[PDB]
Amino acid sequence: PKQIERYSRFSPSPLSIKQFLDFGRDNACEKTSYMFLRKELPVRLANTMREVNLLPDNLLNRPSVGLVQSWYMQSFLELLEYENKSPEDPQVLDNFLQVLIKVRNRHNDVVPTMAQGVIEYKEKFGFDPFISTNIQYFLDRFYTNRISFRMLINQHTLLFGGDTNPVHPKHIGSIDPTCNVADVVKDAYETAKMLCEQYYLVAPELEVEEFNAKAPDKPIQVVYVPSHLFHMLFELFKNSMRATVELYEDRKEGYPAVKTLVTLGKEDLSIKISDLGGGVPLRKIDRLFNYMYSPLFGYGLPISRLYARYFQGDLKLYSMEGVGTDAVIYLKALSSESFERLPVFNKSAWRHYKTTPEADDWSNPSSEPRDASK
C-alpha cells in the first residue's frame, strides 16, 4: 500500500460531457485516451480504497467488504502495469483494451456486494446515529467513483473496441449528442409499467408535457448519457406507480395519471414527475436517501440521485402528505457545464471518517416534557 498511498494523494481529473464529446467526435485518438486512462483509473481506485480502509473495523471486517477491496487491489495492480508501457507499440494498446474489459467484468457485482456488506454489518451490529451518517458519506462517494470508472471505461471500449456494427452509431461512445428527453421518459415509463402491471395487474397512464423556453415548439434535447437518465427516470416511475396503485386499489375512484413536465431554460433541464399516491411525511423524506433505512436492495433512490449529481445535476423530492409527491431531476442544459463530480481523498475526507460524536448544535426536548397543566 505504498503505491496506494501515493496514488490516493493524487487528485482526480474531472471531465465534462463537452470534453468527452469533443474528444470522440473531433479527435478520437487512442494514444491520448490510454495515456489519460492508465493514470486516471488507478488514481480513482486509490482515492476510494483509502476511504474504504477508514470504515469502522466492524464494517471493514465483513467478507463482502474484503472482497470488494481485493477486487479493487487486483484492478489497481493490473492497471499499474501500463505506467511504463509505451503507446507507440499498438500491441500494448490492444492488451490495455483487454484489461479494461477484464476489470469492468470483475467490477460487475461491486454495487450489490458492497450492499451485502453494509446489510451484514447492520443486521449484526445494529443501526446507530453518527455511524450511519458516516456510512452514508462513504457510500455516496464510493458509488459515485464507481459510476465514474464505468463511464471512463465505456468511453474507451466503445470508441476503440473496434465493434464492427455498433448498436447506436450516432452516439459518441455512450454519449448521445441529441438525446431526446421525452423518448427516454416514455421508455423508462413503459418499462416500469410492465413490471407494475405484472405484479399489481394494473398501472397508471403516463402524461408528458414539455416547455422549451430556449425555443417553445421544438422537442427538448440534451447532450447526455441516455442510460443514466433512463436509470433515474425508471426509479422515480417505479415509486410513483407503486404509490398510486397502492392508494387506489381499495377505492372506487379510478387511477390518476403519473404526470411529467420537462422544461429547458438558459441553464437547467428539469424533469418533474408528479403522482397523487398520497404523499410522505417530511420527516420520512430525508431517510429515503439514507442507505441503511433501506414488493418490487433498496438503493434505488440514493443511487439515482448519485447519477444526477454526477454531472453537476441533482435529484429532489417534495411531498404533500395526504395527496402526492413531486420528484425533480435537474440536469445542466450545457455540456460545457456538466463536469464529473468526483470524491477526492484528502484531509477533509479523512476528517469525516474520524468524526467522533458531538453535542447537538440545537436544542432537543425531553422525551417526557413537563406537564404544563399540572
Partner: protein, 97 residues
C-alpha cells in the same frame, strides 16, 4: 494510592435542574477524552442535553450506568485519568497538579 484522577460530577446543566437521567454514554472506558467531546446525554424534564467533556484525559470508569434515572446534582458519574497506563488501576471498584 490510586493513580492521579478526576471525578466528573453531574452539574446543573440548566438553571432549574436538580437531577437528571443518564440516558446514554457516548464514550467507552479506555477512550481518549478531548475537551469538548460529547460525554453523555442527560435527560431532564426540560430537555435532552449533550453533556460535554470539560477536561482532557482518558475514561477510567463509569460510576453511573445508562438508564439510571433521577441522578441528583453532585453525583459522581465517572472517573477520568491523565494517562492510559492508569486505566487498569480502576477496574478495581494529589499529584494531579
Amino acid at each position: 494510592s490510586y493513580p492521579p484522577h478526576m471525578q466528573v460530577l453531574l452539574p446543573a446543566l440548566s438553571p432549574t435542574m436538580t437531577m437528571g437521567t443518564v440516558q446514554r454514554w457516548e464514550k467507552k472506558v479506555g477512550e481518549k477524552l478531548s475537551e469538548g467531546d460529547l460525554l453523555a446525554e442527560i435527560e431532564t424534564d426540560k430537555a435532552t442535553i449533550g453533556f460535554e467533556v470539560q477536561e482532557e484525559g482518558y475514561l477510567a470508569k463509569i460510576l453511573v450506568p445508562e438508564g439510571t434515572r433521577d441522578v441528583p446534582l453532585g453525583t459522581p458519574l465517572c472517573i477520568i485519568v491523565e494517562k492510559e497506563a492508569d486505566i487498569s488501576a480502576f477496574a478495581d471498584y494529589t499529584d494531579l497538579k
